[PDB]
Coordinates of C-alpha atoms and ligand atoms in Angstrom, one line a residue:
Chain A
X1 CA 69.9 59.4 213.4
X2 CA 70.1 59.7 217.2
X3 CA 73.4 61.6 216.7
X4 CA 72.9 63.6 213.4
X5 CA 72.3 66.8 215.3
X6 CA 75.2 66.4 217.8
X7 CA 77.5 65.5 214.9
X8 CA 76.4 68.4 212.8
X9 CA 76.8 70.8 215.8
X10 CA 80.3 69.4 216.5
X11 CA 81.5 69.7 212.8
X12 CA 80.4 73.4 212.8
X13 CA 82.5 73.9 215.9
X14 CA 85.6 72.1 214.4
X15 CA 85.5 73.6 210.9
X16 CA 86.4 77.0 212.5
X17 CA 89.3 75.5 214.5
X18 CA 90.5 73.6 211.4
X19 CA 90.2 76.6 209.1
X20 CA 93.5 77.7 207.4
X21 CA 94.7 81.3 207.3
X22 CA 92.9 83.1 204.5
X23 CA 95.7 85.2 202.9
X24 CA 98.7 82.8 203.3
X25 CA 99.6 82.9 199.6
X26 CA 100.7 86.5 199.9
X27 CA 103.1 85.5 202.7
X28 CA 104.4 82.7 200.5
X29 CA 107.4 84.1 198.7
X30 CA 107.9 81.4 196.0
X31 CA 104.6 79.5 195.4
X32 CA 101.4 81.0 194.0
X33 CA 97.7 80.4 193.5
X34 CA 98.4 79.0 190.1
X35 CA 100.9 76.4 191.4
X36 CA 98.5 75.2 194.1
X37 CA 95.8 74.8 191.4
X38 CA 98.2 72.5 189.5
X39 CA 99.0 70.5 192.7
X40 CA 95.3 70.0 193.6
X41 CA 94.4 69.0 190.1
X42 CA 97.3 66.5 190.0
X43 CA 96.0 64.9 193.3
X44 CA 92.6 64.5 191.6
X45 CA 94.4 62.4 189.0
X46 CA 96.2 60.4 191.7
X47 CA 92.8 59.9 193.4
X48 CA 91.3 58.5 190.2
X49 CA 94.3 56.3 189.4
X50 CA 94.3 54.5 192.8
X51 CA 90.4 54.7 193.0
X52 CA 90.4 56.7 196.2
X53 CA 87.4 58.2 198.1
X54 CA 86.4 61.9 197.4
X55 CA 86.7 62.4 201.2
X56 CA 90.4 61.5 201.0
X57 CA 90.9 64.3 198.4
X58 CA 89.1 66.9 200.5
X59 CA 91.2 65.8 203.6
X60 CA 94.5 66.1 201.8
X61 CA 93.7 69.6 200.5
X62 CA 92.8 70.7 204.1
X63 CA 96.2 69.4 205.4
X64 CA 98.1 71.2 202.6
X65 CA 96.4 74.6 203.2
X66 CA 97.0 74.4 207.0
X67 CA 100.6 73.3 206.6
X68 CA 101.2 76.2 204.1
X69 CA 99.6 78.6 206.6
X70 CA 102.7 78.6 208.9
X71 CA 105.4 76.9 206.8
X72 CA 107.1 78.3 203.7
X73 CA 107.8 76.0 200.8
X74 CA 109.9 76.3 197.6
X75 CA 108.2 75.3 194.3
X76 CA 110.3 72.2 193.9
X77 CA 109.1 70.8 197.2
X78 CA 105.4 71.6 196.8
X79 CA 104.7 68.2 195.3
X80 CA 106.5 66.5 198.3
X81 CA 104.1 68.2 200.7
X82 CA 101.2 67.2 198.5
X83 CA 102.3 63.6 198.4
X84 CA 102.8 63.3 202.2
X85 CA 99.4 64.9 202.8
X86 CA 97.7 62.5 200.4
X87 CA 99.5 59.6 202.1
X88 CA 98.2 60.8 205.5
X89 CA 94.7 61.4 204.1
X90 CA 94.7 57.8 202.7
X91 CA 95.9 56.3 206.0
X92 CA 93.2 58.1 207.9
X93 CA 90.3 57.6 205.5
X94 CA 90.9 54.6 203.2
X95 CA 90.2 50.9 204.0
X96 CA 93.1 49.7 201.7
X97 CA 95.4 52.7 201.3
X98 CA 98.1 52.6 198.6
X99 CA 101.5 51.6 200.1
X100 CA 104.3 54.2 200.3
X101 CA 106.2 52.8 197.3
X102 CA 103.2 53.6 195.0
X103 CA 103.2 57.3 196.2
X104 CA 106.9 57.4 195.3
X105 CA 105.9 56.0 191.9
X106 CA 103.4 58.8 190.9
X107 CA 105.9 61.5 191.8
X108 CA 107.7 60.8 188.5
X109 CA 110.8 59.7 190.6
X110 CA 111.5 63.3 191.8
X111 CA 111.6 62.3 195.5
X112 CA 113.0 59.3 197.4
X113 CA 111.1 57.0 199.8
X114 CA 112.9 58.5 202.9
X115 CA 112.0 62.0 201.8
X116 CA 108.3 61.1 201.6
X117 CA 108.4 59.5 205.0
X118 CA 110.2 62.4 206.6
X119 CA 107.7 64.9 205.1
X120 CA 104.9 62.8 206.5
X121 CA 106.6 63.2 209.9
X122 CA 106.9 67.0 209.5
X123 CA 103.3 67.6 208.4
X124 CA 102.1 65.6 211.5
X125 CA 104.2 67.8 213.7
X126 CA 102.9 71.0 212.1
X127 CA 99.3 69.9 212.1
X128 CA 100.2 68.6 215.5
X129 CA 98.4 65.3 214.7
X130 CA 95.0 67.0 214.2
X131 CA 93.7 65.1 211.2
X132 CA 90.0 64.6 211.7
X133 CA 89.0 67.8 209.8
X134 CA 85.5 68.6 208.5
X135 CA 85.2 68.9 204.8
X136 CA 82.7 70.2 202.1
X137 CA 82.0 66.5 201.4
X138 CA 81.0 65.8 205.0
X139 CA 78.4 68.5 205.0
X140 CA 77.2 67.6 201.6
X141 CA 76.2 64.0 202.5
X142 CA 74.2 65.4 205.4
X143 CA 72.4 67.9 203.2
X144 CA 71.4 65.2 200.7
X145 CA 69.2 63.6 203.4
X146 CA 66.8 66.6 203.0
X147 CA 65.9 65.9 199.3
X148 CA 62.2 65.7 198.6
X149 CA 62.6 63.3 197.0
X150 CA 66.2 62.1 196.6
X151 CA 67.9 62.6 193.2
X152 CA 71.2 61.0 192.1
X153 CA 72.0 63.6 189.5
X154 CA 71.7 66.4 192.1
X155 CA 74.1 64.6 194.5
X156 CA 76.9 64.0 191.9
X157 CA 76.6 67.6 190.6
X158 CA 76.9 69.1 194.1
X159 CA 80.0 67.0 194.7
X160 CA 81.4 68.1 191.3
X161 CA 81.1 71.8 192.2
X162 CA 82.5 71.3 195.7
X163 CA 85.4 69.5 194.2
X164 CA 85.9 72.4 191.8
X165 CA 86.0 74.8 194.8
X166 CA 89.2 73.0 196.0
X167 CA 91.2 74.2 193.0
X168 CA 91.0 78.0 193.4
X169 CA 92.1 79.3 196.9
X170 CA 91.0 82.7 195.7
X171 CA 88.2 83.2 196.5
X172 CA 87.2 79.9 198.2
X173 CA 89.8 79.9 201.1
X174 CA 87.7 82.5 202.9
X175 CA 84.5 80.4 202.9
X176 CA 83.8 77.7 205.5
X177 CA 83.2 74.1 204.3
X178 CA 79.5 74.2 205.5
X179 CA 78.9 77.4 203.5
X180 CA 80.5 76.0 200.2
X181 CA 78.4 72.9 200.7
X182 CA 75.3 75.1 201.0
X183 CA 76.3 76.9 197.7
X184 CA 77.1 73.6 195.9
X185 CA 73.8 72.0 197.0
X186 CA 71.6 74.9 196.0
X187 CA 73.4 75.4 192.7
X188 CA 73.1 71.6 191.9
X189 CA 69.4 71.6 193.0
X190 CA 68.5 74.6 190.8
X191 CA 70.3 73.2 187.7
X192 CA 68.8 69.7 187.8
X193 CA 65.3 70.2 189.3
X194 CA 64.7 74.0 189.4
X195 CA 64.2 74.0 193.2
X196 CA 65.8 76.1 195.8
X197 CA 67.8 75.7 199.1
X198 CA 65.1 74.0 201.1
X199 CA 63.5 75.4 204.3
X200 CA 64.4 72.3 206.4
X201 CA 68.1 73.2 205.8
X202 CA 67.6 76.9 206.7
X203 CA 66.2 75.6 210.0
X204 CA 69.0 73.1 210.5
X205 CA 72.1 75.1 209.4
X206 CA 70.9 78.7 210.1
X207 CA 72.0 79.5 206.6
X208 CA 69.7 81.6 204.4
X209 CA 70.0 82.2 200.7
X210 CA 71.1 85.7 201.4
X211 CA 74.0 84.5 203.6
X212 CA 75.0 81.9 201.0
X213 CA 74.8 84.5 198.2
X214 CA 78.4 85.9 198.4
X215 CA 79.7 82.3 198.0
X216 CA 77.0 81.3 195.5
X217 CA 78.0 84.1 193.2
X218 CA 81.6 83.0 193.1
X219 CA 80.7 79.3 192.6
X220 CA 78.2 80.2 189.8
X221 CA 81.1 82.0 187.9
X222 CA 83.4 78.9 188.4
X223 CA 80.6 76.6 187.0
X224 CA 80.2 78.8 183.9
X225 CA 84.0 79.5 183.3
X226 CA 84.8 75.8 184.0
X227 CA 85.6 74.6 180.4
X228 CA 88.0 77.5 180.1
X229 CA 89.9 76.8 183.4
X230 CA 93.5 75.8 183.1
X231 CA 93.0 72.6 185.1
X232 CA 90.6 70.1 183.7
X233 CA 90.9 66.8 185.7
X234 CA 87.7 67.4 187.7
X235 CA 85.6 67.8 184.5
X236 CA 87.1 64.7 183.0
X237 CA 86.5 62.7 186.2
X238 CA 82.9 63.7 186.4
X239 CA 82.1 62.6 182.8
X240 CA 82.0 59.0 184.1
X241 CA 78.7 57.1 184.7
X242 CA 80.0 56.5 188.3
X243 CA 79.2 60.2 188.8
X244 CA 76.2 60.1 186.3
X245 CA 78.1 62.4 183.8
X246 CA 77.1 65.6 185.6
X247 CA 80.0 67.6 184.2
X248 CA 78.3 67.4 180.8
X249 CA 75.1 69.1 182.0
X250 CA 74.6 72.7 181.0
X251 CA 75.1 75.3 183.8
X252 CA 72.2 77.7 184.3
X253 CA 72.4 81.2 182.9
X254 CA 71.0 83.2 185.8
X255 CA 70.4 82.3 189.4
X256 CA 67.5 84.8 189.9
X257 CA 68.6 86.5 193.2
Chain B
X1 CA 105.2 68.4 224.8
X2 CA 107.7 66.3 226.7
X3 CA 111.0 64.7 227.2
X4 CA 111.6 61.0 227.8
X5 CA 114.2 62.1 230.3
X6 CA 111.4 63.1 232.7
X7 CA 109.9 59.6 232.6
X8 CA 111.1 56.5 234.4
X9 CA 109.9 53.0 233.3
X10 CA 108.5 50.7 235.9
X11 CA 107.1 47.6 234.2
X12 CA 105.7 46.2 230.9
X13 CA 101.9 45.7 231.1
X14 CA 101.1 44.1 227.7
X15 CA 100.4 44.3 224.0
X16 CA 97.2 46.1 222.7
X17 CA 95.8 46.7 219.3
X18 CA 99.3 48.0 218.3
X19 CA 102.5 48.8 220.3
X20 CA 103.5 47.7 223.8
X21 CA 102.0 49.4 226.9
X22 CA 104.3 50.3 229.8
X23 CA 103.9 51.6 233.4
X24 CA 106.0 54.6 234.0
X25 CA 106.6 57.5 236.5
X26 CA 107.1 61.2 235.9
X27 CA 110.2 62.2 237.9
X28 CA 109.3 65.8 238.5
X29 CA 105.6 65.9 239.1
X30 CA 105.5 62.4 240.6
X31 CA 102.6 61.4 238.4
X32 CA 102.2 57.7 237.4
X33 CA 101.6 57.3 233.6
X34 CA 101.0 54.7 230.9
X35 CA 103.4 54.7 227.9
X36 CA 102.4 53.2 224.6
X37 CA 105.6 52.6 222.5
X38 CA 105.6 52.2 218.7
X39 CA 108.7 51.4 216.7
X40 CA 108.7 53.2 213.4
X41 CA 112.2 52.1 212.2
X42 CA 106.1 52.2 205.9
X43 CA 105.8 55.3 208.2
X44 CA 103.4 56.0 211.0
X45 CA 100.8 53.2 211.1
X46 CA 97.3 54.3 210.3
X47 CA 96.3 52.8 213.7
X48 CA 98.5 55.4 215.5
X49 CA 97.3 58.1 213.1
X50 CA 93.7 57.3 213.9
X51 CA 94.1 56.8 217.7
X52 CA 96.1 60.1 218.3
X53 CA 93.9 62.4 216.2
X54 CA 90.6 61.0 217.6
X55 CA 91.8 60.8 221.2
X56 CA 93.0 64.5 221.1
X57 CA 89.3 65.4 220.4
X58 CA 87.7 63.1 223.0
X59 CA 87.9 64.7 226.4
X60 CA 85.4 62.9 228.7
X61 CA 85.5 61.5 232.2
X62 CA 85.0 58.0 230.8
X63 CA 87.5 58.0 227.9
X64 CA 91.2 57.4 228.6
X65 CA 93.1 60.7 228.9
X66 CA 95.9 61.3 226.3
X67 CA 98.3 63.7 227.9
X68 CA 101.1 64.0 225.4
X69 CA 102.7 62.8 222.2
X70 CA 106.5 62.3 222.1
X71 CA 107.7 62.3 218.5
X72 CA 111.4 61.4 218.7
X73 CA 113.5 59.9 215.9
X74 CA 112.6 56.3 214.8
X75 CA 110.3 56.0 217.9
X76 CA 106.9 57.3 218.9
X77 CA 105.4 57.4 222.5
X78 CA 101.9 58.0 223.7
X79 CA 101.5 59.3 227.3
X80 CA 98.3 58.4 229.2
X81 CA 97.1 58.9 232.7
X82 CA 97.6 55.7 234.7
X83 CA 94.5 54.2 236.3
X84 CA 94.9 50.8 238.0
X85 CA 94.0 47.8 235.9
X86 CA 92.0 46.6 232.8
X87 CA 88.6 44.9 233.2
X88 CA 89.9 41.6 231.8
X89 CA 92.7 41.4 234.4
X90 CA 90.2 42.5 237.1
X91 CA 87.7 39.8 236.3
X92 CA 90.6 37.3 236.5
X93 CA 91.6 38.5 240.0
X94 CA 88.0 38.8 241.2
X95 CA 86.8 35.9 243.2
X96 CA 83.4 34.4 242.2
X97 CA 81.6 36.6 244.7
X98 CA 83.8 39.6 243.9
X99 CA 81.7 41.6 241.5
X100 CA 78.5 43.1 243.0
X101 CA 75.6 44.2 240.9
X102 CA 75.8 47.8 242.1
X103 CA 79.3 47.9 240.7
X104 CA 78.2 46.3 237.4
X105 CA 75.3 48.8 237.2
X106 CA 77.8 51.7 237.8
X107 CA 80.4 50.5 235.2
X108 CA 77.8 50.0 232.5
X109 CA 76.3 53.5 233.2
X110 CA 79.7 55.1 232.9
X111 CA 80.6 53.1 229.7
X112 CA 77.4 54.2 228.1
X113 CA 78.4 57.8 228.9
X114 CA 81.8 57.3 227.2
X115 CA 80.1 55.7 224.2
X116 CA 77.4 58.4 223.9
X117 CA 80.2 60.9 223.8
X118 CA 82.1 59.0 221.1
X119 CA 79.1 58.6 218.9
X120 CA 78.1 62.3 219.4
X121 CA 81.5 63.1 217.9
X122 CA 81.3 60.8 214.9
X123 CA 83.7 58.1 216.3
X124 CA 83.2 54.4 216.3
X125 CA 85.4 52.5 218.8
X126 CA 84.9 49.1 217.1
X127 CA 86.8 47.0 219.7
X128 CA 84.9 47.1 223.0
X129 CA 86.1 44.1 225.1
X130 CA 87.2 43.7 228.7
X131 CA 90.9 44.1 228.0
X132 CA 90.2 47.5 226.4
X133 CA 88.3 48.8 229.4
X134 CA 90.3 50.3 232.4
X135 CA 89.3 50.8 236.0
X136 CA 90.7 52.9 238.8
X137 CA 90.4 52.3 242.6
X138 CA 87.7 55.0 243.2
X139 CA 84.9 53.4 241.0
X140 CA 85.7 54.9 237.6
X141 CA 85.9 52.9 234.4
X142 CA 87.2 54.3 231.0
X143 CA 87.2 53.2 227.4
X144 CA 90.7 52.8 225.9
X145 CA 92.6 51.6 222.9
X146 CA 91.2 53.5 220.0
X147 CA 93.7 51.8 217.6
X148 CA 90.9 50.1 215.6
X149 CA 88.6 53.2 215.9
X150 CA 87.6 55.4 213.0
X151 CA 85.7 58.6 212.2
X152 CA 82.4 58.0 210.5
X153 CA 80.3 60.3 208.3
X154 CA 76.5 60.8 208.1
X155 CA 75.2 58.7 206.5
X156 CA 77.9 56.0 206.8
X157 CA 79.9 54.6 203.9
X158 CA 81.1 51.0 203.7
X159 CA 84.1 50.6 206.1
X160 CA 86.5 47.8 207.0
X161 CA 84.9 44.5 207.4
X162 CA 87.4 42.9 209.6
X163 CA 86.1 44.7 212.6
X164 CA 85.7 43.6 216.3
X165 CA 87.1 40.6 218.2
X166 CA 84.9 37.6 217.5
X167 CA 83.1 37.1 220.8
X168 CA 81.8 40.7 220.8
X169 CA 81.0 41.0 217.1
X170 CA 77.5 42.1 216.0
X171 CA 75.3 40.1 213.7
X172 CA 75.3 42.8 211.0
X173 CA 79.1 42.4 210.7
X174 CA 79.0 38.6 210.7
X175 CA 76.3 38.6 208.0
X176 CA 78.3 41.2 206.1
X177 CA 76.0 44.1 205.6
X178 CA 77.2 47.0 203.4
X179 CA 76.8 49.4 206.2
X180 CA 77.3 49.2 210.0
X181 CA 77.3 52.1 212.5
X182 CA 77.0 53.1 216.1
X183 CA 75.0 50.0 217.0
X184 CA 78.0 47.7 216.7
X185 CA 79.6 49.2 219.9
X186 CA 76.3 48.8 221.8
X187 CA 76.3 45.1 220.9
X188 CA 79.8 44.7 222.4
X189 CA 78.7 46.5 225.6
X190 CA 75.7 44.1 225.7
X191 CA 78.0 41.1 225.7
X192 CA 80.3 42.8 228.3
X193 CA 77.3 43.5 230.5
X194 CA 76.3 39.8 230.4
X195 CA 80.0 38.8 230.9
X196 CA 80.2 40.8 234.2
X197 CA 77.0 39.4 235.6
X198 CA 77.6 35.7 234.7
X199 CA 81.4 35.8 235.0
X200 CA 81.8 34.1 231.6
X201 CA 81.6 35.3 228.0
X202 CA 78.1 35.4 226.4
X203 CA 79.1 34.0 223.0
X204 CA 82.5 32.4 223.0
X205 CA 82.7 31.2 219.4
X206 CA 85.8 30.0 217.6
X207 CA 84.8 30.8 214.0
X208 CA 82.2 33.0 212.2
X209 CA 79.6 30.3 211.8
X210 CA 80.1 29.2 215.4
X211 CA 79.7 32.8 216.5
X212 CA 76.4 33.1 214.5
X213 CA 75.0 29.8 215.7
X214 CA 75.7 30.7 219.4
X215 CA 73.8 34.0 218.9
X216 CA 70.8 32.2 217.4
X217 CA 70.7 29.6 220.2
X218 CA 70.3 32.4 222.7
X219 CA 68.3 35.1 220.8
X220 CA 66.4 32.9 218.2
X221 CA 67.2 32.7 214.5
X222 CA 66.4 36.0 212.8
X223 CA 63.8 36.3 210.1
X224 CA 62.0 39.1 208.3
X225 CA 59.5 39.7 211.2
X226 CA 62.2 40.3 213.8
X227 CA 64.7 41.8 211.3
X228 CA 63.6 43.0 207.9
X229 CA 66.1 42.5 205.1
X230 CA 68.0 39.8 206.9
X231 CA 67.2 37.2 204.3
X232 CA 68.8 39.4 201.6
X233 CA 72.1 40.0 203.5
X234 CA 75.2 38.7 201.7
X235 CA 76.3 35.9 204.1
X236 CA 72.8 34.8 205.2
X237 CA 71.9 31.2 204.4
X238 CA 68.4 29.7 204.1
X239 CA 69.9 26.5 205.6
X240 CA 70.5 28.2 209.0
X241 CA 69.1 26.0 211.8
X242 CA 65.9 27.4 213.4
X243 CA 66.3 27.9 217.1
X244 CA 63.8 29.5 219.5
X245 CA 64.5 32.6 221.5
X246 CA 64.9 31.8 225.2
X247 CA 64.0 33.6 228.4
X248 CA 66.4 36.2 229.6
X249 CA 65.8 35.2 233.2
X250 CA 67.5 31.9 232.1
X251 CA 70.2 33.6 230.0
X252 CA 71.2 36.0 232.9
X253 CA 69.6 34.6 236.1
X254 CA 70.9 37.1 238.7
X255 CA 69.4 40.0 236.8
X256 CA 66.2 41.9 237.8
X257 CA 63.3 42.9 235.5
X258 CA 64.9 46.2 234.5
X259 CA 68.3 44.6 233.8
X260 CA 66.8 42.1 231.5
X261 CA 64.9 44.8 229.6
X262 CA 68.0 46.8 228.9
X263 CA 70.1 43.8 227.8
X264 CA 67.4 42.7 225.3
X265 CA 67.4 46.3 223.9
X266 CA 71.2 46.2 223.7
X267 CA 71.2 42.8 221.9
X268 CA 68.3 43.6 219.5
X269 CA 69.0 42.1 216.1
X270 CA 67.8 45.1 213.9
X271 CA 70.5 47.7 214.5
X272 CA 67.9 50.4 213.7
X273 CA 65.8 49.3 216.7
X274 CA 68.8 48.6 218.9
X275 CA 69.0 51.1 221.8
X276 CA 71.4 54.0 221.5
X277 CA 74.0 54.7 224.3
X278 CA 72.3 58.1 224.7
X279 CA 68.8 56.6 225.2
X280 CA 70.1 53.8 227.4
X281 CA 71.2 56.4 230.1
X282 CA 67.5 57.1 230.8
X283 CA 66.5 53.4 231.3
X284 CA 64.8 52.6 234.7
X285 CA 67.7 50.2 235.4
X286 CA 69.9 53.1 236.4
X287 CA 67.3 54.8 238.7
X288 CA 69.3 53.8 241.8
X289 CA 72.8 54.0 240.3
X290 CA 75.7 55.0 242.6
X291 CA 79.5 54.9 242.4
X292 CA 80.8 51.9 244.4
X293 CA 84.5 51.0 244.8
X294 CA 86.2 47.8 243.5
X295 CA 88.6 45.5 245.5
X296 CA 92.3 46.2 245.3
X297 CA 93.7 43.0 243.7
Ligands
LIG1 O1 95.4 50.2 229.0 C1 95.6 50.3 227.7 N1 95.2 49.3 226.9 C2 95.5 49.6 225.7 N2 95.3 48.6 224.8 C3 95.2 47.2 225.1 C4 95.7 46.9 226.5 C5 95.1 46.6 227.8 C6 96.1 46.3 228.8 C7 97.4 46.4 228.4 S1 97.4 46.8 226.7 S2 96.3 51.1 225.4 C8 96.2 51.5 227.1 C9 96.7 52.7 227.8 C10 96.5 52.7 229.3 C11 96.0 53.9 230.0 C12 95.9 53.9 231.4 C13 96.2 52.7 232.1 N3 96.0 52.7 233.5 C14 96.3 51.6 234.1 C15 96.8 50.4 233.5 C16 96.9 50.4 232.1 C17 96.6 51.5 231.4 C18 96.8 51.6 230.0

């Protein structure tokens, strides 16, 4: 509470530095936006199987996107990248990370142990050891402190939408984590309570509803078209009571903007 | 990035949180360096993953300077600027009369700067003890060894419960609270501050209960008035012996009125009320702070 402002300022500085190249998929000659969606969704399943933190998921995705911003990868090696990144995310974030042998287990025995360990090495070289990246999740938890009063359903819904934003690089790769967290928080707040992006956060972040609008429009369409989306692991996950079953709530029809 | 060809090993200094630390010399620039070797032969340990990534972000005059990372096959090196000695080894070589209060005042002031910086950048050190603090010959002191360090979020989640070497471990960790934060590092500095003044550890316990009981004998046994919610904490016991808090003039006799005030705020039971590194820099104790030099060992 003596450092909330310093920390928030610092994370806004770093999110720009840690941002991946927006249009890297077009420069990727073999992989596509669809294949990345399948990988990200698969990592959600891995996260749920080994009971990992949401923060670890967001961290892994950040690593993959940065690694794929300067390195080309064939479709058969995409999962190996995703594995090594998840292994690194877990080592950085988790108290008890799954041991390497278990990560070899969930890759349906496609890759060997040595391959996973050599890809861990490579990612670290490409990311040049810079792993402490800001996430949507890290801004969300700071926003929740501004609830008047605090509401569990709101929190779980905002984390559901933010998690959904990880799936589709188009159009979410062009929005910064703090902005997506703004859109996720407002959208959750309006669905559950009916209230809007609060003034205290406008003062804190410098983000107005108008500035969030471009991202809020995209996110609103993802929330409505969610049960039709090809990847479903995030909806399934958020049916649980652990997340208050927010993925079962009805999305709003219009945002009134 | 660098080549191990350029470096020449001088001597082995000692083990740390992980890996062995060496003294070495750059052959081309002439610069004396510290090398931290880790044998990879389970992949890169999370300790090295944490230390490297966090230390690359932390550029402060009072945090150890990471210069380079050498990522050769089967072996990983960390290149640091070489200062002179760690505080543990310095307090061993220092005679009884050897550490002047102006030097202590200076060291604490600098350490609080390094800590304020860390906490401003969402980093918990979580192993502040004499061996992990390094001095040079010009009056500087720097925090080092971020192997047990981690990045925290706001608000904090539950993190590892192992944390901190026993003598310097805060009450909230010992009593096993769900959440600990920035205030654990302040506690450790509190103990270090007292250690430097008295030339002996403040609470040298051998077990958890021994550590708790030593803290209570000095600060009084905590209750709901001094620390609300303490009776609800997981490892609190109603059978805990009731000791009275004693005078800080008797806990740390050579310390003036301002010094006692700061230490009590650094060793406050309630981590909420415990002084922040940031707020400590403005304490009247440092009104006359300078930068004295230590002896050469
Ligand atoms: O001094 C260091 N200490 C580390 N962890 C625990 C240890 C204390 C003493 C030996 S091992 S890592 C580390 C790096 C480092 C940087 C600069 C130095 N300057 C002078 C002497 C030792 C140094 C060590």
